[PDB]
Design a protein around this ligand. Structure first.
Ligand SMILES: Nc1nc2c(ncn2[C@@H]2O[C@H](COP(=O)(O)OP(=O)(O)O)[C@@H](O)[C@H]2O)c(=O)[nH]1
Ligand SMILES: *SCc1nc2ccccc2[nH]1
Ligand SMILES: [Mg+2]
Length: 170
């Protein structure tokens, strides 16, 4: 089979995880999608000439059993850590997602990309500089996105695939 990249989208409720995923997969903006639904999605794409499958888990937070969270973290190869540029708490929450994923995978080298979503809104509490400072501390890419206009969306997911490739070649 063609290579499949297992991607996991994490972040506080309301940041745009579902909107980002649906924009990536279906090329439309869905402005109301139940915040409590956690589902997988698939898309066959070409990234730098490689035909591959994106197998994406759109997370929704707590699980019936914490074992289910640990399971998807171990299964996932790369993580989109999403905050919204108008939600400071969601930005602060990134520290917890970073820690938890590393903790479950028992790894210091987990492919991740920092994503600041809702860039189409002038209303902003997290400046680009602040997010750059955090991404610098982590040594991971940082991309501002709009699930509404599609700006940065392919970049966010394709960058995560590229980070996974860098991890695999070691
Ligand atoms: N303006 C704007 N609204 C967005 C964007 N992404 C998501 N939203 C809205 O933010 C709300 C939460 O989005 P959702 O995808 O359900 O967030 P999730 O809980 O992280 O899955 C919805 O009302 C979406 O329409 C975006 O990039 N721009
Ligand atoms: S629902 C199929 C599925 N489960 C996943 C876990 C982590 C990353 C991708 C996944 N797809
Ligand atoms: Mg959602």
């Amino acid at each position: 089979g063609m290579t499949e990249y297992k991607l996991v989208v994490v972040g506080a409720v309301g940041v745009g995880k579902s909107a980002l995923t649906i924009q990536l997969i279906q090329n439309h903006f869905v402005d109301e999608y139940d915040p409590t639904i956690e589902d997988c999605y698939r898309k066959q794409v070409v990234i730098d000439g490689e035909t591959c499958l994106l197998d994406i888990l759109d997370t929704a937070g707590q699980e019936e059993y914490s074992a289910m969270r640990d399971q998807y973290m171990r299964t996932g190869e790369g993580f989109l850590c999403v905050f919204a540029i108008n939600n400071t708490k969601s930005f602060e929450d990134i520290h917890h997602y970073r820690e938890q994923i590393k903790r479950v995978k028992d790894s210091e080298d987990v492919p991740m990309v920092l994503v600041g979503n809702k860039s189409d809104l002038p209303s902003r509490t997290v400046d680009t500089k602040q997010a750059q400072d955090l991404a610098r501390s982590y040594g991971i890419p940082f991309i501002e996105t709009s699930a509404k206009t599609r700006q940065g969306v392919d970049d966010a997911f394709y960058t995560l695939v590229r980070e996974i490739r860098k991890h695999k070649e070691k």
